[PDB]
Design a protein. Sequence first.
Lengths: 7, 7, 235, 235
Amino acid sequence: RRRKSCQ
Amino acid sequence: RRRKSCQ
Amino acid sequence: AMGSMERASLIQKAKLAEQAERYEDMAAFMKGAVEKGEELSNEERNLLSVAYKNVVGGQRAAWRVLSSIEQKSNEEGSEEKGPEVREYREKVETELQGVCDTVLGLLDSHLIKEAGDAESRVFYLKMKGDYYRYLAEVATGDDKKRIIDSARSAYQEAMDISKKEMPPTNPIRLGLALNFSVFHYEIANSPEEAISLAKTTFDEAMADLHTLSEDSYKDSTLIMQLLRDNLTLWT
Amino acid sequence: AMGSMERASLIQKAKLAEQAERYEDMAAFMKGAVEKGEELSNEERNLLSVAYKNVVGGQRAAWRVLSSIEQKSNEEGSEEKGPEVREYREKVETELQGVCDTVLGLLDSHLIKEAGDAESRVFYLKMKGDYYRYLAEVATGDDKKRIIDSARSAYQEAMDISKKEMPPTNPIRLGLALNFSVFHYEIANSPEEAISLAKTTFDEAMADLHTLSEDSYKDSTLIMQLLRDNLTLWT
Ligand SMILES: CN(CCS)C(=O)c1ccc(F)cc1
Ligand SMILES: CN(CCS)C(=O)c1ccc(F)cc1
Ligand SMILES: [Cl-]
Ligand SMILES: [Cl-]
Ligand SMILES: [Mg+2]
Ligand SMILES: [Mg+2]
């Protein structure tokens, strides 16, 4: 579960 | 459904 | 190497490269387009961002794989395997830094200085924060604090503009807040600031959803869910 | 550019590049290793194949996307969009051809001529057939028939050796037959030959499974399933 950044 | 080759 | 190609042809080929998942080509075409010296439209800014995010994303993922192997190689009880893991991690790291420097160079020459509307200026300052953040992820030396501060400063200027000039549901504003929150959590060792920013951003966007069309609602809620995903992971 | 790096270090870095999904790097490291002039072990041959198959596989997928767009662009009722689609398809095609020529050059200088054991010789001749097949996929000119015949000839020599020197369940023999069958179906306009080869290969392997350990059985049946997948698609 990797944190989200703006993709 | 793409035919298989040796991967 | 793109100097002889028409701007419109570069943009067309960037879109073809995207369809073909040829992101290195896409980035080279968009760099060529920026270097024509004209401002970018909204669509063109998005193409630039997609291209370089995909290129640097592959490099970052590879760097993390190699960094983990190197870390395991330097544990007690590990057998000496020579300089190769470090050398190859360094090769990937140098390439990654080169891409970040290229993007930062385009922003500095001269995208940011010509960007006057909030949508373009915030977009570019967010990008500047992002690429300094990627430099910070691999930084170990005398300038690491300065790299982190450069990311912080770009994000902060973007935040200040976005809060004054954009509604709380604007997707650029939301994506900026998402990424600045990640900066706080991962780079600046400020998990409480990261959580506070994500929660305030989410709540202020929620309260403004009532003003939006169906399509804008979809756009905004998608990014709000990313904020929520991080809040769930972090709390 | 790999001339100054130790053979063992190139092999080590190829394995790291594989773990990092950096297949262009992996291929460059393996090219460097081949150019040291020593024969390759079984593991090293597999690394060479994995690296270049992944590189050319990405190029082929991109070429097919671009070729389809170009085809649609040249239908009745399509609006003229200029030379850009053709130009970009040609760029990708030329890169793909360059990779195929590089692999064929390694095989010719001097992997095949030094390969005396069936496992190495069949492997390399299969590879030669494969990279001529990839050239044939994009060929349109005066040499297209000669490219197809070069693929056929390499596959046929590999088949002749494999039938004499390997059991019908050997994974190299099976993968060769799979790929030659695809050649017949897709390149040589010989679907009946493709089907006959796949079925005979499958049936002869089935009859030899009883001789195998559990692990070899797993290896062979995996490739047999690929043969069956094609037979199901084609019949
Ligand atoms: C849906 N997404 C990406 C996830 S935040 C956007 O709308 C976006 C927002 C800001 C930006 F700089 C690029 C893209
Ligand atoms: C499982 N696979 C790949 C699918 S055929 C093999 O065992 C293999 C066989 C021949 C070759 F040249 C490379 C790989
Ligand atoms: Cl290296
Ligand atoms: Cl082109
Ligand atoms: Mg406004
Ligand atoms: Mg034998």
